[PDB]
Design a protein around this ligand. Structure first.
Ligand SMILES: CCn1c(=O)[nH]c(=O)c2c1nc(Cc1cn3cc(C)sc3n1)n2CC1COC1
Ligand SMILES: [Fe+3]
Length: 284
């Protein structure tokens, strides 16, 4: 039988709440209490609420600032044109600055106008099925906390810096928003195996994707765009690159503690969208 899946945007209320050891904040209680604070905001959020605005601490804003300054040095030569186009809009309308962490509510309002995408705060990891299902309604489940200040370059756990600098500029691009939504739509009520394959295709596009633009390789994956060292590595000659091809890409193991072994290159967001359309027919 078909598994339960959301049928309207408010149905995400029933799944978005269905949620380390080497972590830099593992032994810090103040950090743990703060993370509990953010988790509770997500857990208590219901669709229709304004996303609670948070007063970030001086330590958190400096951590953001450090990440923000280094990444911005690289974007002009590493990011795709769509990312570079949208990033200045975020600074002007959402307060993206070295000394200010943007509020999810402001970013959500920006995206709703541009592409109909919206943000929902998420306490932690959801199942692949639940996470993908939000995309079907142009809802991106977003972390709201900040990485521990002891290591501003600690990336294996996504934080709000990753969401705001990695994902948000692309969600404001119509072609990318359509591509993303169609992953969500394909996942709705799909088999467990199909959800795994879509989640892997998502991983090697939305999170670690490369694209070809005017004969050059650029980066569009959010995970790369928020990771200083891997952003450089991905466009270096040391990275292994292969064509995005869902029936192949969906078999690739997703790595979390190290650089990817391989990166997949999409011709464009429209082409990646077309390839997924052909692929999803065979798994659903
Ligand atoms: C389809 C796999 N998948 C899943 O199955 N469940 C999820 O909840 C989920 C998820 N992918 C993401 C987004 C993400 C992870 N990640 C790791 C980096 C390193 S960069 C980055 N971006 N999330 C959001 C949770 C992570 O904080 C909430
Ligand atoms: Fe991400």
């Amino acid at each position: 039988s078909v598994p339960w899946f959301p049928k309207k945007i408010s149905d995400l209320d029933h799944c978005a709440n269905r949620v380390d050891a080497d972590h830099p904040g593992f032994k810090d209680n103040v950090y743990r209490k703060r993370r509990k604070y953010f988790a509770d905001l997500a857990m208590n959020y219901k669709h229709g609420d304004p996303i609670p605005k948070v007063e970030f601490t001086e330590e958190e804003i400096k951590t953001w600032g450090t990440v923000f300054q280094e990444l911005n040095k690289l974007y002009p030569t590493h990011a795709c044109r769509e990312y570079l186009k949208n990033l200045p809009l975020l600074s002007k309308y959402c307060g993206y600055r070295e000394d200010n962490i943007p509020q999810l509510e402001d970013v959500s309002n920006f995206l709703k106008e541009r592409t109909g995408f919206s943000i929902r705060p998420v306490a932690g990891y959801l199942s692949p099925r639940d996470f993908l299902s939000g995309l079907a309604f142009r809802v991106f489940h977003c972390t709201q906390y900040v990485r521990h200040s002891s290591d501003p370059f600690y990336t294996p756990e996504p934080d709000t810096c990753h969401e705001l600098l990695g994902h948000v500029p692309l969600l404001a691009e119509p072609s990318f928003a359509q591509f993303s939504q169609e992953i969500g739509l394909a996942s709705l009520g799909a088999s467990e195996e199909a959800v795994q394959k879509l989640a892997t295709c998502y991983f090697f596009t939305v999170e670690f994707g490369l694209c070809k633009q005017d004969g050059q390789l650029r980066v569009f994956g959010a995970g790369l765009l928020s990771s200083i060292s891997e952003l450089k590595h991905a466009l270096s000659g040391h990275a292994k690159v292969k064509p995005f091809d869902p029936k192949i890409t969906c078999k690739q193991e997703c790595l979390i503690t190290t650089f990817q072994d391989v990166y997949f290159v999409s011709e464009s967001f429209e082409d990646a969208k077309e390839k997924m359309r052909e692929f999803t027919k065979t798994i659903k």
